[PDB]
Design an enzyme around this catalytic site. Structure first.
Site, mmCIF file in Angstrom:
data_model
loop_
_atom_site.group_PDB
_atom_site.id
_atom_site.type_symbol
_atom_site.label_atom_id
_atom_site.label_comp_id
_atom_site.label_asym_id
_atom_site.label_seq_id
_atom_site.Cartn_x
_atom_site.Cartn_y
_atom_site.Cartn_z
ATOM 1 N N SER A 1 -31.044 -4.125 122.189
ATOM 2 C CA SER A 1 -30.779 -4.391 120.770
ATOM 3 C C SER A 1 -30.957 -3.038 119.932
ATOM 4 O O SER A 1 -31.800 -2.339 120.336
ATOM 5 C CB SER A 1 -32.135 -5.074 120.193
ATOM 6 O OG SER A 1 -31.947 -5.150 118.880
ATOM 7 N N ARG A 2 -30.010 -2.867 119.217
ATOM 8 C CA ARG A 2 -29.693 -1.426 118.815
ATOM 9 C C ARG A 2 -30.590 -1.441 117.386
ATOM 10 O O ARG A 2 -30.083 -0.222 116.928
ATOM 11 C CB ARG A 2 -28.259 -1.067 118.639
ATOM 12 C CG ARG A 2 -27.658 -0.688 119.941
ATOM 13 C CD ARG A 2 -25.862 -0.268 119.843
ATOM 14 N NE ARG A 2 -25.390 -0.698 120.921
ATOM 15 C CZ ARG A 2 -24.143 -1.245 121.026
ATOM 16 N NH1 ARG A 2 -23.404 -1.214 119.871
ATOM 17 N NH2 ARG A 2 -23.700 -1.728 122.061
ATOM 18 N N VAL A 3 -31.017 -2.246 117.012
ATOM 19 C CA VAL A 3 -31.716 -2.168 115.438
ATOM 20 C C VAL A 3 -33.016 -1.897 116.029
ATOM 21 O O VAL A 3 -33.535 -0.984 115.340
ATOM 22 C CB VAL A 3 -31.623 -3.635 114.641
ATOM 23 C CG1 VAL A 3 -32.520 -3.609 114.026
ATOM 24 C CG2 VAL A 3 -30.175 -3.915 114.082
#
Lengths: 117, 171, 284, 118, 171
Positions: free
Chosen positions: E118-120
């Protein structure tokens, strides 16, 4: 339909345990192929044996297959099959050989077949 | 009737189909390669006497005719999970699978049990042969797999010393 | 499938086969060194058993607990096992034979005790629940007697203190470079000598200081060598079993290579055709 | 066709083909140049017929005979590839040469375990 | 918003584009399949207060709008190198990989961590969860490093045995 709210908790748990230990046996097959069965932990040999006994007990003779083999066909009720698989999984039939489970009806036929080898 | 190689009729039909610029499918065979063999092998049949009467305009009253087919298929490296071998397994009734390992080991004919089957079954046999040879192919289906699994030693010698000497002498 | 995914596993199995070949070689050398060390140990036990036979079954046969068959009410075992896996079925055959005999003994209602040499049996018998009372582990390739002194001392003390009777040693007999058999043998009460020292008639030792206190020490030292001898034979048997097992594993790898390469060939053929058919059929 | 003229004279002839795999591969190139659709592994659609048209002339006759020795090359060491698979249908014998036998100083370096004849 | 089987929108679009005789790309998918999904998924956005206040011409102030997208994709035998999976894995902000070998073993939901990204990250977590999650990530990472020795356990040292049986309890 294989949900606890549809088939009951006992049936669901039995089916999922069968899946879980057959999958664990699948995960061990590749190392058994290389090193042999003697490297397995003492509890892994047990899941291997119970998995092979489940694989045999899944077999069943059919009334329509009564002309490919000679065995009489068997009709197994749901109660008897879960009663048998729940019994195998928790080790109450650990003492029988694998061939006692091949092509039988309920588990009470496997205990009889064991006597005749 | 014996078709000495359907796996080469398939190749000749693939050549004809690709020269006619038809789009090929799996393994570059045409889409209708199944319909090539089926409408052939579906002609080997046994017909009732009413059909023989209706065909011969009455002349042969009350005999039943039959045509028995034995097509031959060659499979690369012994695998049966291939397109044309599986296409023909899906058409014929029985299946005599001859294995190369057995053939090299001197076991000839190398009829591999467990893979070979007869979908007509004991209905085809004379009842003597049917009764004497009840279920032995399925017996060897497990004899082979167990002799393959239990390689280290003949452990749990309950009757395996009889089982795997009976199953050896039968072979 | 996938051609690259299968070639990666072919490479992995080839690496495994190479590792197992190296292990076979190492085990086949350690086996020779161990089985020579096994022969370096005979003279002590032999030339001490002759003495014990002279003092015990000769003239003026002396009396000692370790020589006579008091009634048995509980039994003791010294168990030797490997410290390392991959030895094949070596350890489990021995532990199953021990459990068979130890169950036969408890049918008669006798109690049984265990002393463990090696880590594997220590791990096993606590899972089975055996009554281990002394242990030594981590011997490896360098088994000392000055470390076996401990548990053998425990079992000897429990014997002469009156608790144990008829103690045993269980170990693997090295017989051939590919044949090792689990054996349970009796150390005390002392087994019966095949030979007779009636021919020793014609001489007697000038025992300094005195014969009984000396026979005691002779007997204690003798069980120790025989145990030590059991440990070293078990170690050579371990090396031979690992050699055979890695041989088998290398041949199993060599067959998996054949199967994986057949699968890889089918995969790469299918990939070539599935690409070239898309190209040709795309060109209207 | 030169070997056939020797045959007609009543003789026994040997025909050496230094690499039949290159005959197959040049048939593939010509097929591609003519613009025909690619067959099982990109080979030409006429592979099994182009091979048989050659190998069927190499036969014994009741005037003479042509025997043939053909050097064979297996792509990617795959005995299932269509070219080896098509060639092996015609061969009567198979001689394998091994470098191990030559390192032993044994000549000819024929491997007797894998060498085969029907 | 949940899109269930974008890999079926892709198939319907392949059908439409092949009936229009458009040039087929890889696996016969048209060239613009990426430009099909991207201009869909790039419509899922968080929008600042000034855009909302201008769009509604007043009547809303201070508030930020949002639209979250959870597209679903089916893979054939776990291969990610396919066409549509490649495009959608390239477009989105992260992936939840559900694997059948975990599902069969009873690990449900069968999310595969480490392989899943998850890049958030923590920016989309409550600070308590952000605090507590780092030790779970590190525990499962050490467990993945040690997992090769699982079927050789009881050979291992105790100091790594503790990590190995801790990762199992987190799982």
């Amino acid at each position: 339909q294989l949900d606890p709210l549809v088939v009951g908790q006992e049936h669901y748990d039995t089916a999922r345990g069968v899946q879980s230990i057959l999958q664990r046996y699948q995960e061990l097959k590749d190392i058994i192929a290389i090193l042999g069965m003697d490297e397995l932990s003492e509890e892994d040999k047990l899941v291997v044996a119970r998995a092979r006994k489940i694989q045999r007990f899944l077999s069943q003779p059919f009334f329509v297959a009564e002309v490919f083999t000679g065995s009489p066909g068997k009709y197994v009720s749901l109660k008897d099959t879960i009663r048998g698989f729940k019994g195998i999984m928790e080790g109450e039939y650990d003492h029988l050989p694998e061939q006692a489970f091949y092509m039988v009806g309920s588990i009470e036929e496997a205990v009889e077949k064991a006597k005749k080898l | 009737i014996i078709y000495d190689d359907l796996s080469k009729q398939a190749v000749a039909y693939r050549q004809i189909s690709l020269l006619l610029r038809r789009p090929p499918g799996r393994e570059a065979f045409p889409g209708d390669v199944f319909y090539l063999h089926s409408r052939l092998l579906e002609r080997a049949a046994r017909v009732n006497a009413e059909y023989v009467e209706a065909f011969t305009k009455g002349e042969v009253k009350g005999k039943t005719g039959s045509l028995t087919a034995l097509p031959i298929i060659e499979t690369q490296a012994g695998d049966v999970s291939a397109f044309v071998p599986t296409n023909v397994i899906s058409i014929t009734d029985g299946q005599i699978f001859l294995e190369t390992n057995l053939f090299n080991a001197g076991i000839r004919p190398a009829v591999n049990p467990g893979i070979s089957v007869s979908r007509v079954g004991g209905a085809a046999q004379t009842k003597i042969m049917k009764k004497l040879s009840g279920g032995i192919r399925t017996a060897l289906a497990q004899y082979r797999e167990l002799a393959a699994f239990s390689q280290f030693a003949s452990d749990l010698d309950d009757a395996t010393r009889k089982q795997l000497d009976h199953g050896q002498k039968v072979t | 499938a996938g051609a690259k995914d299968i070639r990666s596993k072919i490479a992995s199995v080839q690496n495994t086969q190479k590792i197992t070949k190296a292990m076979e070689m190492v085990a086949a050398s350690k086996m020779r060194k161990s089985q020579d060390r096994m022969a370096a140990s005979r003279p002590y036990a032999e030339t001490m058993r002759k003495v014990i036979g002279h003092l015990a079954h000769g003239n003026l046969e002396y009396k000692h607990p370790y020589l006579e068959d008091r009634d048995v009410k509980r039994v003791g075992y010294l168990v030797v096992s490997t410290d390392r896996g991959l030895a094949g079925g070596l350890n489990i055959n021995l532990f199953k034979k021990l459990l068979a005999e130890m169950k036969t003994w408890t049918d008669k209602g006798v109690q049984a005790d265990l002393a463990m040499i090696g880590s594997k049996g220590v791990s096993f018998f606590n899972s089975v629940g055996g009554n281990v009372v002394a242990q030594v582990t981590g011997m490896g390739d360098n088994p000392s007697l000055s470390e076996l002194i401990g548990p053998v001392k425990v079992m000897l003390q429990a014997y002469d203190e009156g608790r144990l009777d008829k103690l045993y040693i269980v170990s693997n007999k090295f017989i051939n470079t590919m044949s090792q058999v689990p054996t349970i043998s009796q150390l005390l009460p002392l087994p019966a000598s095949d030979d007779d020292d009636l021919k020793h008639k014609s001489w007697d030792y000038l025992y300094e200081p005195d014969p009984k206190a000396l026979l005691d020490t002779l007997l204690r030292r003798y069980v120790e060598s025989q145990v030590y001898q059991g440990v070293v034979e078990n170690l050579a048997s371990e090396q031979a079993a690992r050699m055979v097992a890695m041989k088998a594993a290398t041949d199993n790898g060599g067959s998996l290579i054949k199967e994986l390469q057949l699968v890889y060939n089918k995969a790469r053929q299918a990939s070539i055709t599935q690409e070239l058919t898309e190209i040709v059929s795309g060109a209207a | 066709t030169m070997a056939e003229k020797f045959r007609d004279e009543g003789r026994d002839v040997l025909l050496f083909v230094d690499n039949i795999y290159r005959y197959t591969l040049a048939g593939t190139e010509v097929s591609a140049l003519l613009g025909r659709m690619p067959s099982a592994v990109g080979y030409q659609p006429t592979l099994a017929e182009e091979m048989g048209v050659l190998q069927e002339r190499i036969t014994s006759t009741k005037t003479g005979s042509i025997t043939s020795v053909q050097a064979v090359y297996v792509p990617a060491d795959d005995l299932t590839d269509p070219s080896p698979a098509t060639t092996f249908a015609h061969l009567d014998a198979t001689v394998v040469l091994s470098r191990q036998i030559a390192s032993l100083g044994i000549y000819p370096a024929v491997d007797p375990l894998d060498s085969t004849s029907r």
